[PDB]
Design a protein around this ligand. Structure first.
Ligand SMILES: C[C@@H]1CC[C@@]2(OC1)O[C@H]1[C@@H](O)[C@H]3[C@@H]4CC[C@H]5C[C@@H](O[C@@H]6O[C@H](CO)[C@H](O[C@@H]7O[C@H](CO)[C@@H](O)[C@H](O[C@@H]8OC[C@@H](O)[C@H](O)[C@H]8O)[C@H]7O[C@@H]7O[C@H](CO)[C@H](O)[C@H](O[C@@H]8O[C@H](CO)[C@@H](O)[C@H](O)[C@H]8O)[C@H]7O)[C@H](O)[C@H]6O)[C@H](O)C[C@]5(C)[C@H]4CC[C@]3(C)[C@H]1[C@@H]2C
Ligand SMILES: C[C@@H]1CC[C@@]2(OC1)O[C@H]1[C@@H](O)[C@H]3[C@@H]4CC[C@H]5C[C@@H](O[C@@H]6O[C@H](CO)[C@H](O[C@@H]7O[C@H](CO)[C@@H](O)[C@H](O[C@@H]8OC[C@@H](O)[C@H](O)[C@H]8O)[C@H]7O[C@@H]7O[C@H](CO)[C@H](O)[C@H](O[C@@H]8O[C@H](CO)[C@@H](O)[C@H](O)[C@H]8O)[C@H]7O)[C@H](O)[C@H]6O)[C@H](O)C[C@]5(C)[C@H]4CC[C@]3(C)[C@H]1[C@@H]2C
Ligand SMILES: C[C@@H]1CC[C@@]2(OC1)O[C@H]1[C@@H](O)[C@H]3[C@@H]4CC[C@H]5C[C@@H](O[C@@H]6O[C@H](CO)[C@H](O[C@@H]7O[C@H](CO)[C@@H](O)[C@H](O[C@@H]8OC[C@@H](O)[C@H](O)[C@H]8O)[C@H]7O[C@@H]7O[C@H](CO)[C@H](O)[C@H](O[C@@H]8O[C@H](CO)[C@@H](O)[C@H](O)[C@H]8O)[C@H]7O)[C@H](O)[C@H]6O)[C@H](O)C[C@]5(C)[C@H]4CC[C@]3(C)[C@H]1[C@@H]2C
Ligand SMILES: C[C@@H]1CC[C@@]2(OC1)O[C@H]1[C@@H](O)[C@H]3[C@@H]4CC[C@H]5C[C@@H](O[C@@H]6O[C@H](CO)[C@H](O[C@@H]7O[C@H](CO)[C@@H](O)[C@H](O[C@@H]8OC[C@@H](O)[C@H](O)[C@H]8O)[C@H]7O[C@@H]7O[C@H](CO)[C@H](O)[C@H](O[C@@H]8O[C@H](CO)[C@@H](O)[C@H](O)[C@H]8O)[C@H]7O)[C@H](O)[C@H]6O)[C@H](O)C[C@]5(C)[C@H]4CC[C@]3(C)[C@H]1[C@@H]2C
Ligand SMILES: CCCCCCCC/C=C\CCCCCCCC(=O)O[C@@H](COC(=O)CCCCCCCCCCCCCCC)COP(=O)([O-])OCC[N+](C)(C)C
Ligand SMILES: CCCCCCCC/C=C\CCCCCCCC(=O)O[C@@H](COC(=O)CCCCCCCCCCCCCCC)COP(=O)([O-])OCC[N+](C)(C)C
Ligand SMILES: CCCCCCCC/C=C\CCCCCCCC(=O)O[C@@H](COC(=O)CCCCCCCCCCCCCCC)COP(=O)([O-])OCC[N+](C)(C)C
Ligand SMILES: CCCCCCCC/C=C\CCCCCCCC(=O)O[C@@H](COC(=O)CCCCCCCCCCCCCCC)COP(=O)([O-])OCC[N+](C)(C)C
Ligand SMILES: CC(C)CCC[C@@H](C)[C@H]1CC[C@H]2[C@@H]3CC=C4C[C@@H](O)CC[C@]4(C)[C@H]3CC[C@]12C
Ligand SMILES: CC(C)CCC[C@@H](C)[C@H]1CC[C@H]2[C@@H]3CC=C4C[C@@H](O)CC[C@]4(C)[C@H]3CC[C@]12C
Ligand SMILES: [K+]
Ligand SMILES: [K+]
Ligand SMILES: [K+]
Ligand SMILES: [K+]
Ligand SMILES: [K+]
Lengths: 355, 615, 237
């Protein structure tokens, strides 16, 4: 992979030269370095070939075909003592395996990051190789017109042209004038639109479903907060907020943090948005100590537990509320708790908690 | 899946090149997808049905090392789930009869169906783990000696070792959690010797605790013998079960030779260079009595108050007329084993709904001392009528295994029941000293059962005081057992023969045939079959080892007990506030599994032991 | 959102202006292009809308490089901010609002059990071709949103039938449909229910609510059981 990067840099340097020129092998050592890189690639190709279970499917591998179009040109170049630009830009396709390399180096661990790196690598590689094709075709000129249609475009101008085209901007300051160049631009537009349409679902998956009521409460200094849990619906929250946040109530610097494991509906969302300056909501369970740490229950002034007045079994609701009290007092025994109890005989259980 | 992957893919587990492929026709949710992505390098998932042979060919079941079938513990009908799992076993064995299968079974009577499959070879590694049978046997053996469930759970589960430098109980406790269970073939030098001699040699020289052997005979099949007496002699090629911290040290039992290893005492220097009335059942291994109607065992509150119960077992049940059965026989069978004398049997009193108990009485009416107090476990009047302050053990069980909107809330009843019993007051003085075992659906609730603890909320299950003291039983440890069964198939057999009370396959076949326990007249063969070993605890306050318990070493106690009474000591149940200089009123004790030879003793200690039967 | 968009637009335009007017540093600043700041603002706006006239563009190497990076970053930021755009667009209400009282045009408020069959029968008899010309509109009030068949039926009679989402028991919804000026209120009943008495009690409570809002309105209700209609004599209005 490192030698592939080096060969790509060699191609970048060589693209600033006439596309076909005679040279001496012994006079310049950059060509010698490229020759060494190519013979190493040939040795690696032979090593893969001698240990391949299927000859046909290995022959159609993208690494095999990208090695097929690189080393015979350099063999002919060193035999003829003259260099042609060729299809060296195809070396950029070797960047596709980049994510795998990082994995071996244990730099990437999560699957989403690996997939993101793979997507970026494939996008960059196809961009660079399309730019290389356009540069070669434009600078070479049309073959049937005695190469009189050459346009002096650098490689980076072709990269800029590909980027402007694929974003559907199309300034028109630089464009392909040759027939083969225009044909390849039409095919590139078609293929790019098709590939983007195919890769849209992966883009949506990587964007994913953003959490709405995650995160943790931020403890504002000098501002007490009350944690409210239990049966959180429209009516109970509406009544509690109506009495608690009264206009005639004396100025109290107390915030209210609701904790509940069912996401709010439209009415609750509107009610929370109306009181967004004093009321926060979080999705979680009281029985989970991590969620208790999220809402900073260790610094709350009090915990208020509301009850489901409208249930098939009042005793089950009472037991659930008592278990919530047990969990909260287990996390922090010194917190003040005000709970709602449905049946009278169930409150004696609260005397069984030493906290 | 979380429990199975947590035990299977442990960091301290030795490097194993095994991948896991899940096959299920319900697509995973967000949490399962995240869990799979966390282990994406070792865990794959596929959507399909086991009953479809195409899906079986998809996951390459013909080359899999094993197939593991998990069961839905939370279902309306356990029998339907058991039938579905048996049909899955049938499908897999139809596709490939030579594959090894480990399945989970809910009810005990349903596993006999696995013997109807011709391809099911128990001797080749096919195993069924019965959740109800194993769980209730663990609870019963903990009734006989508290903390045994914790010791067993720590004995076959991978636990990460943490070094503790401060003088707390977690240090002494964490020493034993390191121990594991292994099987090894005894060396040829041990043949012709009695079991106690070989056990003492293994403990002193090789520093291995040999618990049981596998005895072979021409008349019957191979049978596991738990601490046999000195009358037995080691044969050739006998498997032995050891408890050891390191797997490499177990090979010393196989490479031992008296010629060039008896002189050297250091185990590290050991090398491989050799040089008229029916009182028992038909098989005679359980106490039996003539069947009686349920009306003759029901006690009213006043009637239960008139009688005096001391040293008994109180089973509180949150049953219902429509709730799923839990198979209470698996709790009563170990407590009615024939190796206990009749006067040593503990009275069992079931406190719960009579509507639920009428459905279970059909399998319980053949046992000697069982009583019913119709009521609820949450009433202090019923608990006072049954003398809860004098019981040997209180077992709180929840039959309502139905799914609840919140998984943790499934434990809402039992916890409150526990907190009720700890808060009661008695006069001739409080319920905090009453021994209680509580089953728990969620591990995260285990810390709700104790309040005199300093555990931070992120403490793992095995380090909490309720688990370390054996006062809480978490069913999730059974989910670890399956993994422990995959790497070694003898572990499950040893656990079953140590826990269930000695259910021989002949008794299994008889129960499968009749779905009942049949009595029989006593014969010398059955009376010889009565002689076994039992789990017990001893105190060093006034026993024959009273002088040795005052600062003596554990190895001397082990050697003396094994040499004199053929007693196998394998653990210390130690008072929690024993290392502190200041006196304390706490009566809680924790479990130390297999202490070293130089371990010091204190007079306020209990010793786990395997008693022999004598008449 | 508007402030962040405007700020990033202005700062990108200023940066392009600086780079273009300065010229390439390695070519002795001979590549300067005389672009004003506002021409660069126009260039950024034309680029980010993917129009690209080409009348003005960056000629320097640094200018083109930063234009490529700006295109990439702008597309990425737009893709990230699409969900907030959808949320701010939100879910538009379909059957909200209030009835508009047309002068000289009476209206009838219909409530109760509103489904396809009952509404179809009532509209079939009420809006008959042979019926004499009556200038009466029909306003349905129901808190369950209509399905496809009901929507098609309402669209067929869109010139005479309106629908609104609300509850009769809520006085705000009663004020929405202008019940204080309605000629009559017609309450339909659910003929296929598990408990007829519960449906009758619900309809009687709807009558109580309507007569509480406006005691002088005329009400025609459907009753399932015969013994339940005596409750209607307990209402003083
Ligand atoms: C190890 C891993 C793998 C990948 C990698 O590292 C990590 O490998 C590294 C290594 O392999 C690097 C390459 C090593 C060889 C380098 C060669 C270098 O070219 C040299 O540049 C010199 C500059 O003084 C000389 O060039 C002459 O310079 C004169 C002015 O000073 C001109 O006059 C004359 O013309 C030039 O001469 C040049 O060379 C000929 C003379 O012999 C002809 O005159 C030719 O015309 C002309 O152009 C010299 O002569 C020429 O050779 C080129 O600029 C970069 C180069 C290729 C490097 C690019 C980056 C790499 C690939 C690195 C890459 C990251
Ligand atoms: C992956 C990283 C980023 C990209 C990069 O590094 C690797 O690629 C390197 C390589 O590609 C370099 C180029 C190689 C070719 C060079 C050619 C050289 O000569 C000039 O080249 C012009 C055409 O480009 C003229 O024609 C004429 O031949 C001459 O005036 C020019 O002066 C600088 C030059 C263009 C270099 C500029 C700097 C680079 C782009 C380097 C750049 C940092
Ligand atoms: C060259 C141009 C570029 C731009 C463009 O044209 C070509 O590209 C086109 C292409 O890219 C289109 C997108 C392709 C991918 C599409 C995906 C599609 O979502 C599909 O919706 C299904 C609905 O059933 C699936 O939903 C599953 O449904 C299951 C139950 O059946 C549930 O489980 C759960 O819900 C889901 O799982 C699942 O959600 C998904 O399969 C979405 O509804 C529209 C979508 C995003 C398309 C929107 C419009 C486009 C962008 C087009 C756009 C004009
Ligand atoms: C540079 C270019 C610009 C243009 C473009 O490409 C790049 O930008 C891309 C990007 O912007 C895309 C959008 C990103 C945001 C996407 C959001 C996605 O909706 C998702 O759909 C999920 C489906 O499960 C969620 O739904 C939740 O599901 C819950 C139950 O699971 C319910 O609660 C309730 O329903 C919802 O809550 C929720 O609804 C939402 O998370 C929608 O279906 C397609 C979507 C709008 C995409 C459409 C196509 C795009 C516009 C792409 C487009 C080609
Ligand atoms: C700045 C950007 C520069 C872009 C320059 C132009 C590059 C494009 C030019 C050329 C690439 C053309 C071939 C695309 C790849 C085909 C194989 C493949 O991986 O398919 C993928 C998508 O692709 C498809 O689904 C097929 C698209 C075929 C388009 C053929 C158009 C011919 C005219 C498979 O997708 P998936 O998610 O695995 O399913
Ligand atoms: C007319 C308009 C003119 C526009 C001119 C060009 C401006 C763009 C140029 C440059 C801006 C580049 C950085 C974008 C901001 C990153 C940080 C950030 O807030 O991320 C946000 C999105 O952004 C992302 O999700 C990351 C996008 C990174 C793109 C990097 C491309 C590099 C080539 C976070 O989004 P969220 O909703 O909080 O989640
Ligand atoms: C509202 C405030 C916005 C803008 C207030 C107006 C600022 C520009 C007008 C004064 C500069 C001017 O015309 O001088 C010269 C430059 O000519 C230009 O700059 C013309 C191009 C203007 C692009 C549109 C303005 C910004 C778009 C909207 C930006 C919204 C943020 C005259 O050029 P000439 O004679 O053609 O040679
Ligand atoms: C970061 C590495 C990227 C790039 C490193 C820089 C490479 C190009 C700079 C040296 C070449 C250069 O300026 O020479 C001449 C060619 O001029 C151009 O090539 C100008 C157009 C550049 C387009 C933007 C670069 C690629 C876009 C992004 C590609 C991302 C992959 C000067 O031309 P003149 O004097 O105007 O006549
Ligand atoms: C999968 C890929 C590699 C196969 C596609 C074939 C490509 C590489 C071939 C087919 C036709 C070729 C072109 C045909 C004619 C000429 C004229 C001459 O000046 C050499 C370059 C140029 C412009 C060639 C460049 C390479 C080319 C585009
Ligand atoms: C986060 C931001 C602020 C950091 C990015 C660095 C920017 C501001 C710097 C880095 C290189 C700089 C350029 C380097 C050289 C020149 C040539 C000279 O005529 C001054 C302007 C100009 C064209 C500079 C403009 C500002 C510039 C682009
Ligand atoms: K355009
Ligand atoms: K244009
Ligand atoms: K262990
Ligand atoms: K466009
Ligand atoms: K354009």
């Amino acid at each position: 992979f490192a030698l592939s990067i080096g060969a790509l840099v060699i191609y970048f340097i060589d693209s600033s030269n006439p596309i076909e020129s005679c040279q001496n092998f012994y006079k310049d050592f950059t060509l010698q370095i490229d020759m060494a890189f190519n013979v190493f690639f040939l040795l690696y190709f032979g090593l893969r070939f001698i240990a391949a279970n299927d000859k046909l499917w290995f022959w159609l591998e993208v690494n095999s075909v990208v090695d097929f179009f690189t080393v015979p040109p350099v063999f002919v170049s060193v035999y003829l003592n003259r260099s042609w630009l060729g299809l060296a830009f195809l070396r950029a396709l070797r960047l596709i395996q980049f994510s795998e390399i990082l994995q071996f180096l244990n730099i990437l661990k999560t699957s989403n990051s690996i997939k993101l790196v793979n997507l970026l690598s494939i996008f960059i590689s196809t961009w660079l190789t399309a730019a290389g094709f356009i540069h070669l075709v434009e600078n070479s000129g049309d073959p049937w017109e005695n190469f009189q249609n050459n346009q002096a475009l650098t490689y980076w101008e072709c990269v800029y042209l590909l980027m402007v085209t694929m974003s559907t901007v199309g300034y028109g300051d630089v464009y392909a004038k040759t027939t083969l160049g225009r044909l390849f631009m039409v095919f590139f537009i078609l293929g790019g639109l098709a590939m983007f349409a195919s890769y849209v679902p992966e883009i949506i998956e990587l964007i994913g479903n953003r959490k709405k009521y995650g995160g943790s409460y931020s403890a504002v200094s000098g501002r007490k907060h009350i944690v409210v849990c239990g049966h959180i619906t429209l009516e109970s929250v509406s009544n509690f907020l109506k009495d608690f946040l009264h206009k005639d109530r004396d100025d109290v610097n107390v915030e209210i943090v609701f904790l509940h494991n069912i996401s709010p509906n439209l009415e609750l969302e509107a009610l929370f948005k109306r009181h967004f300056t004093q009321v926060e909501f979080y999705q979680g369970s009281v029985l989970n100590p991590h969620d208790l740490a999220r809402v900073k229950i260790e610094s709350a002034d009090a915990c208020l537990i509301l009850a489901n007045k409208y249930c098939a079994d009042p005793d089950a609701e009472d037991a659930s509320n008592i278990m919530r009290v047990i969990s909260i007092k287990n996390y922090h025994p010194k917190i003040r708790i005000i709970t709602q109890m449905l049946q009278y005989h169930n409150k004696a259980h609260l005397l069984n908690i030493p906290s | 899946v979380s429990n199975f992957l947590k035990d299977f893919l442990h960091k301290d587990r030795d490097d194993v090149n095994v991948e896991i492929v899940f096959l299920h026709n319900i697509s995973p949710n967000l949490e399962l997808e995240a869990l799979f992505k966390r282990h994406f390098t070792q865990v794959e998932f596929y959507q399909g049905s086991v009953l479809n042979p195409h899906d079986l060919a998809r996951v390459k079941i013909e080359s899999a090392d094993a197939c593991l079938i998990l069961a839905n513990k939370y279902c309306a009908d356990p029998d339907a789930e058991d039938a579905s799992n048996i049909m899955r076993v049938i499908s897999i064995k139809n596709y490939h009869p030579k594959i090894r299968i480990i399945t989970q079974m809910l009810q005990y009577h349903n596993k006999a169906h696995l013997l109807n499959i011709p391809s099911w070879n128990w001797k080749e590694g096919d195993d069924a783990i019965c959740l109800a049978e194993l769980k209730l046997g663990f609870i019963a053996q903990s009734c006989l000696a508290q903390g045994l469930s914790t010791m067993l759970a720590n004995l076959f589960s991978m636990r990460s070792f943490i070094k503790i430098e401060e003088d707390t109980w977690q240090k002494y406790y964490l020493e034993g959690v390191s121990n594991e269970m292994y099987t090894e073939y005894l060396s040829s030098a041990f043949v012709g010797l009695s079991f106690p001699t070989v056990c003492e040699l293994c403990f002193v020289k090789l520093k291995l605790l040999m618990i049981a052997i596998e005895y072979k005979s021409a008349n019957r099949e191979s049978r596991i013998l738990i601490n046999p007496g000195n009358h037995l002699k080691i044969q050739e090629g006998t498997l032995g079960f050891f408890i050891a911290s390191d797997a490499k040290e177990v090979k010393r039992a196989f490479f031992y030779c008296k010629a060039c290893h008896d002189d050297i005492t250091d185990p590290k220097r050991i090398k491989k260079c050799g040089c008229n009335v029916k009182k028992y059942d038909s098989t005679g291994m359980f106490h039996w009595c003539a069947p009686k109607e349920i009306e003759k065992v029901i006690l009213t509150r006043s009637e239960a108050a008139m009688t005096v119960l001391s040293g008994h077992v109180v089973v509180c049940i949150f049953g219902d007329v429509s709730s799923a059965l839990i198979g209470l026989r698996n709790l009563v069978m170990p407590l009615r084993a024939s190796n206990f004398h009749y006067h040593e049997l503990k009275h069992i009193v079931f406190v719960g709904s009579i509507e639920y108990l009428k459905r279970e009485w059909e399998t319980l009416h053949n046992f000697p001392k069982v009583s019913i107090l119709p009521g609820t476990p949450l009433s202090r009047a019923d608990l006072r009528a049954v003398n809860i302050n004098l019981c040997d053990m209180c077992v709180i069980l929840s039959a309502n295994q139905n799914n609840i909107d919140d998984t943790s809330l499934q434990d809402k009843e039992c916890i409150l029941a526990s907190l009720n019993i700890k808060s009661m007051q008695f006069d001739d003085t409080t319920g905090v000293n009453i021994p209680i075992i509580t089953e728990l659906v969620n591990d995260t609730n285990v810390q709700f059962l104790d309040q005199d603890d300093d555990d931070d909320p992120d403490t793992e299950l095995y380090l909490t005081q309720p688990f370390a003291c054996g006062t809480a039983f978490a069913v999730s440890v059974l989910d670890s057992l399956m993994s422990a069964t995959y790497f070694n198939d003898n572990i499950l057999t040893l656990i079953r023969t140590l826990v269930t009370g000695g259910a021989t396959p002949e008794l299994e076949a008889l129960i499968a045939e009749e779905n009942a326990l049949r009595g029989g007249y006593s014969t010398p063969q059955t009376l010889a079959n009565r002689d076994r070993c039992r789990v017990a605890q001893l105190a060093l306050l006034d026993g024959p080892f009273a002088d040795l318990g005052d600062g003596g070493c554990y190895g001397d106690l082990f050697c003396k007990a094994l040499k004199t009474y053929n007693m196998l000591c394998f653990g210390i149940y130690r008072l929690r506030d024993a290392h502190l200089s200041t006196p304390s009123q706490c009566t809680k004790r924790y479990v130390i599994t297999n202490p070293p030879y130089e371990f010091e003793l204190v007079p306020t200690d209990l010793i786990f032991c395997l008693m022999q039967f004598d008449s």
